[PDB]
Structure formats: structure tokens, C-alpha cells
Design a protein that fits this description.
Chain B: The active site is at residue 155. 4 copies of one chain form a homotetramer. Chain A contains 6 helices and 17 strands. With 336 residues, the first copy, chain A, is α/β, with parallel strands linked by helices. In chain A, the strands form 2 sheets. In chain A, strands 3-4-5-2-1-6-7-9-8 form a 9-stranded mixed sheet. In chain A, strands 10, 11, 12, 13, 14, 15, 16 and 17 form an 8-stranded mixed sheet that branches. In chain A, helix 1 (12-21) crosses helix 6 (318-334). The structure holds nicotinamide-adenine-dinucleotide (NAD) (4 copies).
Chain lengths: 336, 339, 341, 336
């Protein structure tokens, strides 16, 4: 059986998730909810500044739009309690608005005429299972009603930290992600509705420090690293594409070659490995959740003690979205 | 030490609202006593202090309860979405700078004029066909001071108007098309996403695209230069600079002209609002300038075939500070003559 | 890749934006093969820049550096680093037609340096090449070629955008005179930050990704090389703006006939083909990056301003100054190679 | 009583140095050498994308230009041995081309018709005195013939690292500078003359990793930190303005408040202190060589051991230039 999915928030993550679902057999989108009309959503699906033209035909209709002739209903309900997901057979909602990223808020979708389960496309608090595909999706059994796909940065950091910890033992660490600007930053200096005096600044014209919980919350994905990491972000003027640096001390003294070999050994469809001196535009659109860059590995040793630096790339858009849809595809197969 | 001031309120402490506040600091006859926006005083104080394109504030800013002090002088801050709930009169406010983008029509702006409100409103944008629309030093003579709502026009209008008027007075504009290559603004999306105004092009990442867009400046020029009503139209290309813009105008004229003739006519019309340059500048060179319009003699062109000519004239403007300088010139003058 | 299409061997002088994108498009045609690349650098730099491309994406295939060149899908291509075309032994690698894409030899006598006794046989300049070389916009005037030419020009990006639009408008309604503005991506000839411009251009000296930068362009004045009836009728200029590729051309004219917006748009759509596209969607510049049209007419930007019975008419066409031009350039190269003799 | 100065390389640092010298008494520029016509240099001095209009008048003349009425000679000699610095009385040369930044190369200026001293506006190798003003300018005695004003990153890092080391003892450290793009990166993807596969990439459209020697070479300015630090850079799309992050282990456990207090106590004209959540555009044009940002300080502690993070802003243009001219001014006064 195909599992019918709804998208709440047809934004950067919602629209790219829709795109990837077109190539998934076990899942199909039957309903989109946002705050606008079908022509606006159909246009944003067709044309994409950073991810290119949509691969398919899109035609606006009354009450929605057709993708290759398949009608998808569009509604514009600000309150999840008012989205009649059940009318379109939706069982799983991708909660991608940025405004319901907590357990009780996501549960608003699960009313009498709503859906059955929710995947939050963001950190969702410490009382919802938080899944980085191919790092801890084993924790799912399908009975969950609300789960989280974590953040872009968590999906980048987690395979790198886990491989390094499994091989050498992370004692403590600090993370800096140099991160594309996102839709939550202001295009020009102005009041930020979340009260962030730095996200209030022109996002494409500044290096912007910002907090991020990815390192401090890593225990949701790698329990043994709870209480071991912290970090922050520098938001910079690229419209997508990011990189995560992690500096740790380890239980073992290591060489750069030994580090790079341990990362390569852990590589898979989610965690890539490169030795090419790439830049951020080269990871736009990739499907790895995290691309380890061996060219940036460093070890600083003084008096027999080492600081170790490991670096991994990610397209905060498509890398995260590929991970999100892998998790959604797996969750849908085992949902009950 | 003096008290010869008209008290002003700012609705919308945004790019234009904050820069207007900055310029009013150097005006003796007007004083801002009340700001209304949608946020708390620390956000507004911080945005006044630090400014990506216009630099650090020239003075001290300190957050206080219910507002902030600028060089020790308290400015009250409120956060009322609806003008009917702003008690402008409590702070002695006579004139409101309506700079939110959400009340830029006569009946909307008049919401500030309730029984506990202000006496007059200046809309920092085009305000419709039924409010006096003023480009300072081009038509501020139309004001008599009895008006309750006026418009400061748009940035593009304040750039276009002195150039079009100088050209029309000298040679007679028959018809024209305008293109403004314009910085992105806060009404465009930082990344591709639903645009609340329904504009499928403003929906696109504004700092990563050349974005065509409509503009009414040329079509509505008759509010400022009546002789040019029904003679001009145009459009915009929004491009990835965070401020700074340029207006190109192509016309046919009653008289055949040379490039030197055109440039001389522009220079003879230059003043505090309409500048003149022969240096090959680029857009960053006009950020912060106080001209409403800076004619660029290096871009003038004449294309003649069979004794008929197309004429091109180009003028720079900082859509932020150029407009704001014009806006505050108009506010200062209006304040002097207000009922 | 067993086929019966005759193959002409091509060399690329200047493995830059146009040179590398030309190489990419030639991968997908069979009548032409690149067997030699000349630039000023080492093979690993060129291989890396082929593999990874900020605006046009990852190369479609494998690229591996080797001694003296690199392999593309396992096929070795020789790389040399000769500053003077007279020292490029094109003939050693069987090259018969050279793509002159350095920007430093864009005139007849300069391009002929490639045609020495151990050199090539013909040159295609990837730029305006002067008044005395045939200048070709594919699907507008490539019929002027007879195959005997030794040096030809693929014109400029702006010319390939403007030409089909101006030709269609002129054929339908008669252009009397016109002015053009192209709002154009910055290019490699602008400075990344304020600094001395080798060409002496005080505006290309300025930081290209941080400014709106006016600049000259000869596309409108030189249109007579492509559309003879429009010689002496057009002029224009450019505004370079901060996008790394993607451009748009506005043309304002007066016409022999009074027209409506719908009549203009209809005339453009009737003239559409592989080189001249037509859209009614409200797109922006990133939507044409990588497009293979030389020119994409945008019906949403058409305007007519009429006063006292006379009209100004505005028509607008998009172009990726990189891939739009390169698609046209390789169409012309492919056609030229077929008829070359 | 006025030392005459020549500028080789009227670029970003050369022109901003000229601008700052306008406002000091002891030195005056009497000769400019570059590779171009006087109108090009006059135009670039008058109009400046990131640093604003020149404060004064600039008029092109024959063989040079006038600044506020005073003629400055302009020449275009590619080889320093051909620059007759002596005929304009030039005593000290600011070597700001980027092409003569080592001892023997800079000494080409000191020919029989040349200057007597040269200040390299860049790292100049490990055999020339390397000066960060108000950190180690006391090493100069005035007899030197070639000195170095270090790099922008060094002038940022040094006062921060010195104050932290003096207070708590740095054991080892790794540095990341998130740095504006510069003139040595390509405006669009193309062959990089220095052979750098990452500086070959479009500088205003990418996050670009790159090496930097500031941390490894810190021993030239702070000898006790020789062999203790390393690091790297991420070049990002702002045209000027940068930030330096430093992660260390220390001999003493500390609090965030203790760190911030130690930095504020060390603040002076070169080393600023802020607690405001600023972004990169807020330090453009600033005259601190380094502006410590107390809002980004972090301490990560596990098992009684800590990683400590300290961060400082710098306008790689004007911050470095203010430091360079401070050193030039002092060097001129003790020159012998
Ligand atoms: N790099 C990224 O962009 C990224 C990466 C990983 C996770 N996320 C997370 O994904 C979520 C969405 O981020 P985004 O970048 O796509 O933002 P976005 O602004 O592009 O999309 C949000 C969408 O939600 C719509 N919306 C807002 N409120 C709504 C409501 N009450 N009801 C229905 N629709 C509503 C908006 O109109 C918009 O289309 C956030 O939680 C964000 O933290 C973003
Ligand atoms: N180049 C320019 O930016 C420019 C030039 C000329 C005119 N204008 C005009 O000035 C006006 C403001 O433009 P801007 O660029 O400064 O926009 P902005 O977004 O920077 O500022 C708008 C401000 O209004 C606040 N606000 C929004 N709704 C409000 C409400 N109901 N009540 C109180 N405050 C509210 C917002 O929080 C914001 O601070 C627009 O009408 C615009 O067309 C802008
Ligand atoms: N939008 C565009 O970029 C565009 C569009 C149409 C036409 N053109 C034209 O194509 C040509 C190349 O433009 P580009 O953007 O690719 O520039 P580019 O700088 O990216 O490439 C030029 C290449 O030529 C190399 N080179 C320079 N001098 C050389 C020499 N003497 N010998 C061998 N190689 C040399 C350079 O190292 C570089 O790789 C120009 O004539 C330009 O006007 C460019
Ligand atoms: N953030 C910065 O820009 C920065 C900061 C600190 C130090 N530096 C250092 O300052 C130096 C210059 O940097 P920049 O950014 O100002 O570069 P730039 O390209 O802006 O200026 C260099 C100038 O030198 C000219 N020039 C080149 N070769 C010459 C030669 N043989 N003879 C005479 N003039 C020549 C060039 O025409 C140019 O004007 C570099 O060593 C650089 O590492 C730069």
C-alpha cells in the first residue's frame, strides 16, 4: 500500500521533500497546507533559485495543482486543528512550517479529522524521538505518533562525531558551523519576530553569529555524547550550502591519516567522503546528509596532548531533505 | 537651549523610519517623541545603533523601560498593530511619519487622526491619487499646511522627478519609458518563499536574482509633474545590492538635442536635491548621499535615425538615504507651515 | 560511442568559463571532438575546474589528472600552456578548428596566429572579432557561412540574445531606431574588489559582486554584422550587477507600425525555435542559468507607451551569458565543422 | 621633522594606508608606485566600495595627482630596483603589492637611488621583525631596514591570545577565521595564478576553505606561543570584515565571566571590547586591530577539563591598516 503524506509548510524543506518523494515508491503526497494560493505554491515548486527547475509538469487547478496530471489539494489553514487531513487519506504529516516544532504543537495535526503521525522537519524537543537516518533510525518501531528529523547541522555532525567517537573516544568538543543564511534571517536590517538581534540583520550582507543547539542536543542521537559537546554558528552570505567544524580531545592520540581512514571506513549513502578541495557550491543539491572533507583535518599536539579538528560539508537544504525523506520512507513502511 | 520644535511620531521604525530618525537628529525644528512598531525597545534600540548599510548611529542609545534614550533623551516605544490604539497625543505628537508599508492610502493613514492621536500624517510611500504627493524642491510649493495626509512619493519618484522636469522644461518630453535597476528591499523574500503580497517575483531570493518588478513611478508622475501625466511608463529590475539604485529614462522630445545640450540642462537645474556628476561612479558611491537624485552625465545617450532621436538620461539614488533626505526636507517644511 | 558521423577534431585556447562550458556541450555531440586544450596553467587546475563549477554544477562524467593532461571518462586530452598561439602545435593532435576563448586574440590577425604550418585550419572566436570577420548568431544568420572561412566570430552573449528578438520585431513591424540596456551578470573581466583594471575601465575596476556597474557594450551598434537592415539604427549600454551568471536584455524602439502588446508577443512566439525561446511565466535570472536557448523572450515584460498616436515599444529577452552563449557557440561550431573545407 | 613615505602597491591596503596617513603629522606620502595610469589610482582613491568617499579632493595631474592641492608623484615600475624613491625624498616604503613580501625581495627598494627602510604590509618570513602594534612594537629599535606589519589575522589574534595566555596559560590551540574574500581570489571560477584550487573559485559565491599561517607563526609576535597553535580560514562572501575564533586548553580552569574580564582589562586603542551582539558590517572601517566579542565566549567542561573559545572581530582592511599606520608612525619616530 502507498502511504499518503501531507506537507504542512510548503517552504524550502517542504518543497524539496515533495521533490524527493516523487522518486519514492512507498509514499505519495495528497495534500499541501500553507498560507497562500495554489498559483504561488505551484510557481515556487516549478522554479527554484538554488535547486533548479522542477523535473515534471505542474499545472494550477481550482483548489490545488496537478503534478504530471495528478491533482494535489492545497489548503491555507493557519491552525493545524483546522486541517482536515483525513479527507485526503493523509496518515503522516511533514510538519515543515517552523511554527509547530514541539510535541504538543505537532499533536494538533492528530485531531478527529486529521492525520495519524507527524514528522517534524526540525529539532522537536527532548521528549520526541530524534532520528538521523543511518545513524540511529533503528530506534523507530512505527508506533510513534510524533518524531523529529533533527536539524541540518545535526545530520551533518552526527555521523562524523559517531565515527570519531567509536574509533577514538570523544572526551569533549566544540563545534562551529559556517552556515548559509536561511528564511528566518531578515533580508535587510529589521525587527526579527523571534527577538534575535543577530538574525535581525541583513542576512546576505553579513557574517552573523548565532546560537545552535545541535552540539548540546547530540545526546538525542548519540546518547554517549550527551553533555560532551557545545557549539555555535556563523551565518554567511551564500543562499544554501554549509560546513561543520568540530574540535575535540580524544581518549587516543591519532594522526590525520588515521582520522581520515576512520571516516572513510564509516562512509555510506548518508555519510560521504572526499579528498577533493571543494567549496560550498559543490555540495548544493547533494544527497549525502554529511560529506566528510579529509583536506581540512588537523591535529595540534603539545606535550603529548592533542586537539583534533574534523570538518564535514552539507547542503542544509538538500542534504537535510534527503535524510528527512529516507527517514519518512522508513517510518511509513513500519507505521502502525 | 530652546523649545521651538514640532513633535513627530514614527509608525514603523524600519529602514526609512530609522534613517528618518537619524536625519531628524540634525533638524532643529522637529523632534521625535514616540515610536510605534511591533517589537520591544531593545530590538529597536539595537537596530538604531547598528546599521549594515548606513553605519553606526552618531550618538548614544540606551534601552530603558518602555522605550530608549538617545543622548539621554527618552523616546517612548509602543507596539500597537492598529493606529487607532496608538495614543500619539500623549506624547504631544502633531505629525506621524507613516513608514510601515501597511497604511499607505488616505483612509488608512487617517486612522492616526483619532481623538487621542496625531494631527497630520506623512506617508513615506505613494499614497494614492487623492493625497498631495511631494518631491521636495520639485513641487513642495503645492503644500499650504492645511493638509491632514500627504505623501512623500517613492524613492524612484524622487529620483525621476527632477530629471524629467529639467528635461521637459528644456526640450519637451513627448513620451517615455523608464527602467530602474534597484537594490532589493525588505518586501522581497530572503529565500524563495510565499510572498504575502502575491507577487511571484518578490517571492524569489532577492539577493541571488535579477528580479523584474512593476513600479508606478513613471505612470503616476503626473501627481508631481502634471504636464507629464499620461506620458511615461516603466518597470524595475531588482538586483543583489542591499541599497543603492539607478533610474534610466528613454524619451522622444519636441526638440533635437546633443548629449552636451542635455547634460548642460541637467547641471543648470542642479540644487540640494538634484545633484550632477561627470565621474564614472557605481552604486556603492551613492550609499548615504543626501541628494534625492544624482544625474550621471556619463550615461547620457542620443540615438538618431532620419532626423528623429531617442534620448536616454540616467540618475543615481540611494533608495534609502536619498529618499529619506527628501522625506525629512518635506517633513521639516510641512512642520513649519502646519495649521 | 560507435557511430558513423564524421569527426572534426577541435582545440580549445582558453579553458575558461566559455572554454570549459563549450567542452561540456561538445561531450553531447558526435561530429566534433576536443583533442587539445591550451591555457596558462597546469593540468590539475584545469581538471579541477572542469569537475567542479560554481554556477553550472558538477561535470557529467569522470575527470582524472594525468601526465600532460587529463582523462575525461578515460579519454586522455592533452593540455599545454603556451602563451603565444604561434607556439601551439595544434597539428600534432590533429586539431583542425580552434575555439579561441582566451579573450586576448579576438581579432582577425590575432586569431590567424593559430593557422601556422603546425597549427590549425580555422578559428572560431568566442567573442566579437571585428568588422572584417563573419559574425554568426546560430539560427539567425549562420547561412552566411560557406565553409571556406579561416576565422569567424560567434559574436557576444548579448548579441545572441538581442539578434533573434530584434530580427523578429523588425521583420514584423519595421524597427526605425532603438536603445538597449542589458542588466548583465558580472564576468571575469571585472575586479573582485576595487583595484586597477588592466583594460583601463574605471568601472570594471570596482568590486563586481558589490555594485551596480554601468559599462559600454557594442552589441547594438554592431548588430549590422548579423542583421544588415539594422546597421546604424541601434545603440545601448550595460548595467553589470551582482549575480555570477544570468542576464537580461531590454530593447526600446519606435516602429513603422503601431502595435499592441499581444501582437508583439505573438510575433515573438511565431519566431521561436531551438535558439529563440518564448515564456509567459514570471521568471527571474536564476531560472535561466544553464538554459540552452540563446535568447528567451519574456512576454510578461513587454510594454507599449503611446502618446499622440506614436509609440515607444519595449521588448525583453533573458539569456544565460554563459550557457546560452555556449549553446549557440557550439551549434555554430558543429555546423561550421560539417561544412568546413 | 616629517618623515617622507612611499607606497608600492596602491591597492586596498595601500590606499587605506594613504587615507590614514592624511590624519597624522609625522609622515607624509610623496610617491606612489603601481602598474597603471594616474587617473586610475586617483579614481580608486576618491571612490571606495567598502570604505566610502575619500575625505578631501582628488584631482588628476600630469604624472600624478593632487590631494587637497598637494601633488603626489605616480610611477608604474614593476621592479622595485627601478623606483627612484630618493628623488622624492622617500625614507620609508610601504611594500603593499603582495609580490615582494620577503626580506631579500623588500631589500630591492634600498638601492642607491631607493629608500632606506621598508615596511612589508604582510607576513614577511621568519627572519624579519614582525610587529603587531601595542602587542610587541617594543622590539623595534629603529635601525631595522625591513620589518613586517604581519597579517590582518595576526593583528586580530595576537592581543586576544596574549591576554588569555598571560592570565591563564595557553597550552595548545586551534583557530578558525571566517574571513572576507580578498583580491587574491577569483571573481569567477578560473585558473588561480598561485595554484590554489580553492582561491580559483568564485569568491563572492562560495564558502572557501583556505590555509593561513597566522596561528603557526604567532611566535614571531608572542614567542611563548611558538609551536602551540595552528588553524585555517573560511573565506565567505562579504567584501570586507572578518572574525577570528580560537579554541584552547588552558593551565587553569576558568569561567566565561573570568575570560571576558581578562580581555576587558587588556583593552586599549588596538584591542577593543564589546558585549553588543554585532555582525560583520558593524566593524567595517573600525580602527581597533582586534575587537573582542564577549557574547561569543564559551567554556565546555567535561571531567574537570575545559575547552575554551574566544572570538574577536577585525576589519581585515581598516583594522589592519590602522595597526600598520600606527607601526609606521612609531617606526618613523625612532628611525635611525
Ligand atoms: N536549511 C533549512 O532551510 C532547514 C534545514 C533543516 C531544517 N529546517 C527546518 O524546516 C522548517 C522549515 O524551514 P524552511 O527553511 O523551509 O522555512 P520556509 O520559510 O521556507 O517555509 C515555511 C513554510 O511554512 C509556511 N507557513 C508558515 N506558517 C504556517 C502555518 N501556521 N500554517 C501553514 N503554513 C505555514 C510558510 O508560508 C512557508 O511556506 C524549520 O523548522 C526549519 O528550522 C530548515
Ligand atoms: N528603499 C526603501 O526601503 C524605501 C524607499 C522609499 C519608500 N519606502 C517605503 O517606506 C515604507 C517602509 O519601507 P521599509 O523599507 O522601511 O520597510 P521595513 O520593513 O524596513 O520597515 C517597516 C516597519 O514597519 C513595522 N510594522 C509593520 N507593520 C506594522 C504595524 N501594523 N504597526 C506598526 N509597525 C509595523 C515593521 O516591524 C518594520 O519595522 C514602505 O511604504 C516602503 O514602500 C521604502
Ligand atoms: N558571459 C561570459 O563569460 C562570456 C560570454 C560570451 C563571450 N565571452 C567571451 O569569451 C571569452 C572568454 O571569456 P571567459 O568569461 O571564459 O573568460 P575567462 O577568464 O574565464 O577564461 C579565459 C581563459 O583563457 C586563459 N588565457 C588567458 N590568456 C591566455 C593565453 N595567452 N593563452 C592561453 N590561454 C590564456 C585564461 O587562463 C582563462 O582560463 C571572452 O572573449 C569573452 O569576451 C564571455
Ligand atoms: N584584507 C586585505 O586586503 C589585507 C590585509 C592585510 C594584509 N594584506 C596584504 O597587503 C598586501 C596587498 O593586499 P591588497 O588586498 O591591498 O591587494 P591589491 O590587489 O588590492 O593591491 C595590490 C597593488 O599592488 C599593485 N601591484 C601589483 N604588482 C605590482 C608591482 N610589481 N609593482 C608595483 N605595484 C604592483 C597592484 O596593481 C595593486 O594595486 C598583500 O600582501 C596582502 O597579503 C591584505
Amino acid at each position: 500500500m502507498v502511504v499518503k503524506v501531507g506537507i504542512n509548510g510548503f517552504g524550502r524543506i517542504g518543497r524539496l521533500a515533495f521533490r524527493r518523494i516523487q522518486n519514492i515508491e512507498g509514499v505519495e503526497v495528497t495534500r499541501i497546507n500553507d498560507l497562500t494560493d495554489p498559483n504561488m505554491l505551484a510557481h515556487l515548486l516549478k522554479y527554484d533559485t538554488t535547486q533548479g527547475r522542477f523535473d515534471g509538469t505542474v499545472e494550477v487547478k481550482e483548489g490545488g495543482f496537478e503534478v504530471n496530471g495528478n491533482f494535489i489539494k492545497v489548503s491555507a489553514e493557519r491552525d493545524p486543528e483546522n486541517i482536515d487531513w483525513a479527507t485526503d487519506g493523509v496518515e503522516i504529516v511533514l510538519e515543515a512550517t517552523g511554527f509547530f516544532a514541539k510535541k504538543e504543537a505537532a499533536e494538533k495535526h492528530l485531531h478527529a479529522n486529521g492525520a495519524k503521525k507527524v514528522v517534524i522537519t526540525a529539532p522537536g524537543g527532548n521528549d520526541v524521538k530524534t532520528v538521523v537516518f543511518n545513524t540511529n533510525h533503528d530506534i523507530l518501531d512505527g508506533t510513534e505518533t510524533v518524531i523529529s528529523g533533527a536539524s541540518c547541522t545535526t545530520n551533518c555532525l552526527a555521523p562524523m562525531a559517531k565515527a570519531l567517537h567509536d574509533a577514538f573516544g570523544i572526551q569533549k568538543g566544540l563545534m562551529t558551523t559556517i552556515h548559509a543564511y536561511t528564511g528566518d534571517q531578515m533580508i535587510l536590517d529589521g525587527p526579527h519576530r523571534g527577538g534575535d538581534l543577530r538574525r535581525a540583520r541583513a542576512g546576505a550582507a553579513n557574517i552573523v553569529p548565532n546560537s545552535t543547539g545541535a552540539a548540546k542536543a547530540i545526546g538525542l542521537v548519540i546518547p554517549e555524547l550527551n553533555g560532551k559537546l557545545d557549539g555555535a554558528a556563523q551565518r554567511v552570505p551564500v543562499p544554501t550550502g554549509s560546513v561543520t567544524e568540530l574540535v575535540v580531545t580524544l581518549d587516543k592520540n591519532v594522526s590525520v591519516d588515521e582520522i581520515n581512514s576512520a571516516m572513510k571506513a564509516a562512509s555510506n549513502d548518508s555519510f560521504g567522503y572526499t579528498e577533493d578541495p571543494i567549496v560550498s557550491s559543490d555540495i548544493v543539491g547533494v544527497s549525502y546528509g554529511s560529506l566528510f572533507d579529509a583536506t581540512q583535518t588537523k591535529v595540534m599536539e603539545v606535550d603529548g596532548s592533542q586537539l583534533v579538528k574534523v570538518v564535514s560539508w552539507y547542503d542544509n537544504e538538500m542534504s537535510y531533505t534527503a535524510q528527512l525523506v529516507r527517514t519518512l520512507e522508513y517510518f511509513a513502511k513500519i507505521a502502525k
